[model samples]
Target chain A: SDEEILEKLRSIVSVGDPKKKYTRFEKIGQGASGTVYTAMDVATGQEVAIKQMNLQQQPKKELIINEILVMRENKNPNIVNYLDSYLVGDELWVVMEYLAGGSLTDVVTETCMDEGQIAAVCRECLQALEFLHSNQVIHRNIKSDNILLGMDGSVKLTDFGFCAQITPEQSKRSEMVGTPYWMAPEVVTRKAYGPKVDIWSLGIMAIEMIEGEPPYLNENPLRALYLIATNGTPELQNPEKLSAIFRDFLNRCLEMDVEKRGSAKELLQHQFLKIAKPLSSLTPLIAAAKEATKNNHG
Target chain B: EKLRSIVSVGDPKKKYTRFEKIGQGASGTVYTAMDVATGQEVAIKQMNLQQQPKKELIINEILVMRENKNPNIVNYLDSYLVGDELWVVMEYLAGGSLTDVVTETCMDEGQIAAVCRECLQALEFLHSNQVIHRNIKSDNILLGMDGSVKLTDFGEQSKRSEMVGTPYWMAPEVVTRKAYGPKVDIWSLGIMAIEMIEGEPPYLNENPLRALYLIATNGTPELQNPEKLSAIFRDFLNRCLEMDVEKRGSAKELLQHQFLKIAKPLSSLTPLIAAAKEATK
Candidate 1:
């Protein structure tokens, strides 16, 4: 029965051109779940990313199912596309469109993005977030890593394992669920956390994009999380590096009180990101990369 | 009576197969179940004792249900402990939840007026009894098979205490944790009215806490003049959403508001009949 389930899941994905077999030639990357393999659609020869969940490790069947449901229900390009899904024995397989370009995290890490580029990326992410939040979906884990960059330079938000639909009547959680470095103060303190937790993470991500790495970082992650939770985020001394608009965007996202943070829709319409446009070319990448490298080593 | 006897054990006397699990939260699991007895479908909420702090929720449900009797209020059939689980039988309405219907379907001015009229009547009854349904949201409001509304889930009910309702729907005084009474419900009613018009809550934010903060400080949600909705409706919503508890209209006062005035004659008779029918149903 398990094998049948796995086979049925595998059938959801077309292997290669003409549906011959699976191959590892197009290995894109790997993460907590498993290796992401770039496979071509047998019929159309279109490239697709096959994200296989490592059942050997911590298996998240329910989470994967929920993600599939959310992705299927949500039909925005800004949000990640869910092509198909299947199960292989104990492992689960999620077939998604393969973006040639890596994640926003990778792009930012590889090169320093200009204010325009940063603003463009921020706008797309905010729009996607607005749609998700309006549908009562909370993207719990928002980070550069989960944001994929399309070849067209558009941003696609992926990963919904930690996402949840909470009502206004619900209370915040004290449990630490997301990445410590990107976590909000309340989340780190084990205080009640809600959608504002996502805003806090977005602010941290914005800071990382602007300043290359978060403001608070040390030899210890726990220490960084503690500082973020207690001391609060460091002030952006030269916000001009990113635009005045983006600076305000980051400020609203970084607001300590969850209630004070603006809604995703509100943030998208914010003057900061709204005014900033994307760069036509990639020359700014060289300078951004240098700054990122310096920050990483420093 | 023995605790075991007081609580229903094992399979339900009437097993209503769950068509869908609507939602699961800290309190209980809600399932859209088909009533085996009357062939009428209803919602069955099964509370997990292991997840529950104690028998407080069970006791609260029974106490509130026994004391309160209103058409807009959800009727509690029976709550008995079934093994480790506590099953509470409730009236099922096929029209779906207020949140779902409002957001998914189109409700004209008449429907909105009718819904609000019934809600205010029920709220008046609850406030007069010195009880507060702290958690008032679209999700908690159930739409009956016959175009009526019923407020469900008294988990957050308290003895007229303040600051118990959801933050976004809460009055400024409630958000500040100031001592108050049924006036808080008016603020919630205001939020609900806005949700009906906009198809979403007014202070809704990606960050709920931020929404809550805004609600406490901002006084009232900014209501754009909806073209389809009436100015009187907008005025009534603003009055209900008023920050000052004194200025906010009471349930009785709300019943007479210009916006609701058109529906008052129908509501006066509809509520009593609905209450009696709901009881029998």
Candidate 2:
């Protein structure tokens, strides 16, 4: 009977009722514009994550539309899937496929990862980046916080909150973005930039994974920004733990001149990535995270 | 048991090309893997059952998925468990979580109303099914490229009385460890409504522990700058935020309010799906 009514409603409404499909629950994360929760689809009885955002928070209708209109084509397997979304009353409710393993930040802090594991992650992200760059979009934020893991040993590039869209036609634009530690000198200096900016931050993220913190961990945020703006080049914190090729990969990524940074496509075929462990090799790490997450979250 | 071991390390059965991790949870991880021959996208969740009984979790997820076959829900594709590791498959949505909309874009009152209508329908559906969504928040709200607003993360948190969700959104009864039922989700939706308008949940400025205390002690939260919103919207929040659970509006009742009359077509919502992939960059 419930199924019959649902079927009737689906035919009756032009847009259909998505809210009619699932029951929502659990606030897992909170941020500037949205809050995340866990919910269950009534039809499938499977779990899904819901991310809700307040529209009035953005202030202007144009900003709201521009914000809603602002994303790039993200179809890469190494990326998060967009499930469903709607404006509920005054709030924006989004349903996402739930991921329990958490972000690379979880792995960096809670779990142990070898260099091979790290390389595997780097390769996956680069491939995603390669795909995004091909479409003229730049993932401005590339850090552990934005890299999510799955039990199948897949890693995706997520949290495109700070991403920029640039095509070969327009080529370069200048607007300072990204976390200070991972911010490129060009970005920190507020100069015109392109996809290469992501490469710089990618290097910083690599060092972060290796050392458990990005460059200038001891310095103040303001100080780090100034040093990055002035110093021009940043070296890995502990290059000794890395092999020559891995060390070289970070160096190429940290190049101050945009011309020197390797593109995502080029990086994917780099020496480090070639030698990286198979993607599925990370399964043990995920299974290990079972205990690690419990200990950390508990 | 033998079949389980072979598939545990990797699926020799090779039905899918395990790629894209779409979700993670108490059980394990979920991936948006592809079927090898068909090339269709599907979700695979790795459920690691260490201490719990595997049969019950598997049966529960499958049974619930089977019972639920609504247009708004995610349908189960397949599932199997081997050596304490279980993988469950389902449909995949490309639009991503509603979090993308909040952080990257803005919405209108009409759009919000549409979402409200859909959520109520789902809540009513679940309520009738004798299911309770103890946890409700924006993070649990999702959307598809096609403009559907689906609910997710249906509160495994319910196994315990409280303490898993953000304190600001928790119902007072749920916070004090007081026994509660499905009504608790209604109270949270009220809080979520405020969040949609104000950008942050009430008492968000307060520390999480303190916010939980306030929720337990304070009867109800008054909307911040209530005059800035429409009367009907205000009234809706009022009805949901009623201090007593008995007085709060049921999902079925809320769906009938005049507010649902002003909703924009769901087709207009695909902008979010586009914006999510584009600006959700």
Candidate 3:
């Protein structure tokens, strides 16, 4: 009796070539996994950065997928905004916001940063890490190189290739992924570690800002790995020159015991952060670095 | 950057006017709303940020929905953060879900075939993109007053090894907690095909755990009134419910089934939808 009526809906609804949509310009960065370029969105006329990676040549396909997955969900101001992703033949084109000030690495290497500026960068990075850790996302790669700065004084986390998730059942991970100099001792020893690994990396970055480079920057990667495991947390080159509060902040982050290591939340509350300058205070530093890079590279 | 709209910060009330509640699930409550800017009706899923277990699921839902759009799939309009509640706005389907069709009205063989075709098309698109809908059932299929059949409620993530679906509609591999792939959806669609014909899912009367046990232990589910179905329709179901995951026909192959060859125009579903609405009133 009821076999006739089976259907319907009333409402109704771009596979455009990436090359046609965005005009590629200068190469902004190059890495082992991908090449990034500054491009203009032809439709919106807005500046954007496109990271193109060849799927055929990728060391691991799953990592690229994981990076896209993580970036797609992240919407924090302290994290680089993931705009769009497309597959053009064997290459994956990832479009993100273009930060004119370049990476934090350029800022650290090109010009010296005062302790106040260092505190400001730490505050911003910790805010991003705070959000990530709360979401059970572990940013295994957290260094000056992965942090980008906007000309308007914005600091955001980028490069999610080494990110991992901490599920309820698996609260810790044992993956040995990250730069050798910034790698935590547990990560080097292949021991199970959690979000604290990122904190240690940030501590190493703090050292980078103060000492002009990370500890063992001159050493070979294999030697750096051995030193990171054998030696405890590396001390500042001029530990007596820095404020007691700043040294204490580093001590909390570089705690060898994962249990005692301060989380992003606790680290944000450190007294060193009390001296953190306003975000706008970073503008001059960024402007100086850009001018310095242009003068030297040109 | 121009292709996608990022999740906006602050009050969604500035953009959308929330109305009566339409549906509710473990994720949150769905409400009928209007887009303040476009003057079009929309559906907003309001989720409390306090729920820790469902937080990652909401992110996954947005990641999947925001990235893809197919005519046979629900279109994600926008998302907003309203204090402790996350507001995810999507296209509103006026005809409700396919569950209403089976429960309130009835489906002929041609109507069932039409639905299978539409769902298969959407599945084909998603699977090609390396995305699995994971949870496919009668309830997840939305219909428009104009005879539109679109898939909704996608739960996507990298870890397919976890248990995260309804007991009744779960594939055998899913219920058994085995590592599964996109083929799992093929089985659920087969169950949904059975649902369209038989009025309810298999083991509808059993406890949820008992139903999962049955799904894990039992092989392919049989139609209650197998004699009433046509040979072509039976064959289609057979291809979908194959125990061996590899042997199950992919969505691409299933779209060419003989049963779908007999599928009526999508507009055939309009009268049935009107009937369901009338029954509701």
Candidate 4:
């Protein structure tokens, strides 16, 4: 109804009110950027996840644009697809493909995942990581919470809020980013790091799937940071619970020396990944998580 | 507005220690500098922001370079607004442009094929991304001392309907002031092939406007010594120089042509680069 408001934003401004085109169903989640909601596109009747990012500050606005720019060109099966974006008031609405199965966090919390399920997820995450690393992108955050699943058992990596593009002149990044428990030791200790940080986080994520919680989940945030920095690689809660190959794979991922840490491509060829179950096997876990969430809310 | 924040800002002198001047352009001067932090040699282009006719062109170039990371494309290192001057840091290619090679020595067919393959690969990458390198010539093709061939000088990194490019190397549609697309680069590439063969493009001695008129009115021009070219080489040229934009082979299709098979290893061009630099010195 308001063509004038759309004209004022100048760039990527289409519908002044996203609700005019996408009918909001409900709030799905919240992120560092802003609140996300599930909506239905009026034109095609397709479900979409839209993030209403409030940009009262210019710094976060730049980050949001950076996220959009990164996702726009990187169209891979293992990465969440960016659909479109619009400017509504001071908020930027970013629409993405709706993953009905929700984040991997939902599944890990609500159900006991088998080793095969974990292997499949790790395989998919490595594929996405390999693609990003090859393109000079560091995902920065690679925990289970950032990985999303679909009803068809499709897996994708999301959340580019802390991602950094490594330029040729500056190959190493020194910034401390990501959750304390999942941060690579180099990152927590303020040493220059690179793409290998994501590999370490993925290792911790594998531990989370095995033990139902990460190594320092119960520790204070700063204490967890200190432990991760000082303790080197954290041991598994139940060492005997994993197969030898799985333990070996996790060791490769959690290597103390960044250079020795297996790359996404190297990890994909590890013997443990050979036993990964088909993606369709994940559908039941997704369904179980959805039902658990519904029951908990009731 | 947001684009400014992505690039680091500071005095270029503090970050990069200046060395000798490397090259100069109409709008800016390039220097070989040492990045103090990494102790790496880099090429830096300095432009006075106040003197720029259109700052948007600079912005477009940076945006295109930032988005692209291909082996065949010149790597953009970093950029900064230093006082009233904008300093752009780029990967240093020790071997200079193809223009240096052409001016110094004639290229054999194998060397021309190698250059064509590399340029076509860059064009393929750009076209796939919906980007058009509106200016395509031997001058824009760069070489590294390590035998690396890359495409540089992307003033027209984005698509443009307006007439923009050197007259002798411009596509017919571009000279006629008609709307054109990525295939326009293919046409210019064909002219570049001729430049490699004959040491100059067609109508080189003619008036600039006259060349433009000739490009528009004339169909595909013949090679200076058609009998000298292999049948496969002539076939490759014909595909690129086709008058009809729709019928012209895209960069991807042209990559599969038989002529590209004769392309020698990239190292074959290094000796020529040495020869050029030696002659110029």
Per-model TM against the reference: 0.47, 0.48, 0.48, 0.49
Candidate 1 residues lying further than 4 Å off, grouped into runs, are A1-298, B1-11, B14-25, B32-37, B48-51, B156-167, B176-180, B203-210, B226-229, B264-281
**Which digits, one per residue and each the tens of the lDDT, describe model 2 over residues B136-212?**
77767777767888777673332101121346777887766667887887888888777766755577555343455
Clashes of each: 19, 65, 11, 0
TM-score of chain A of each: 0.81, 0.85, 0.89, 0.90
TM-score of chain B of each: 0.77, 0.84, 0.86, 0.89
- Over the stretch A1-298, how does candidate 3's per-residue lDDT look in tens digits? 2111100000000123677778857786665557789999999898999887655455345556667778877779999998887766555678898888877887888788888999999999999999999999999878888899988889999988778988999999875677768889998777899999999999999998888788987754446666888997996777898889999999999999989999999999999999998889889888877888889878
lDDT string for model 3 (B97-140, tens) is 89989888779999999999999999999999988888799889
i-RMS for every candidate: 14.7, 16.3, 19.3, 28.1
Error of 4 at B40 (Å): 65
C-alpha positional error of residue A109 in candidate 4 after TM-score superposition, expressed in Å: 1.9
Q: Model 3: runs farther than 4 Å from truth? A: A1-15, A19-24, A29-32, B1-281
How far residue B93's Cα lies from its native spot in candidate 1, in Å, is 0.8
lDDT of 2 by residue, A74-139 (tens): 666887765666655445666666666677766665556777888888888888888878878787
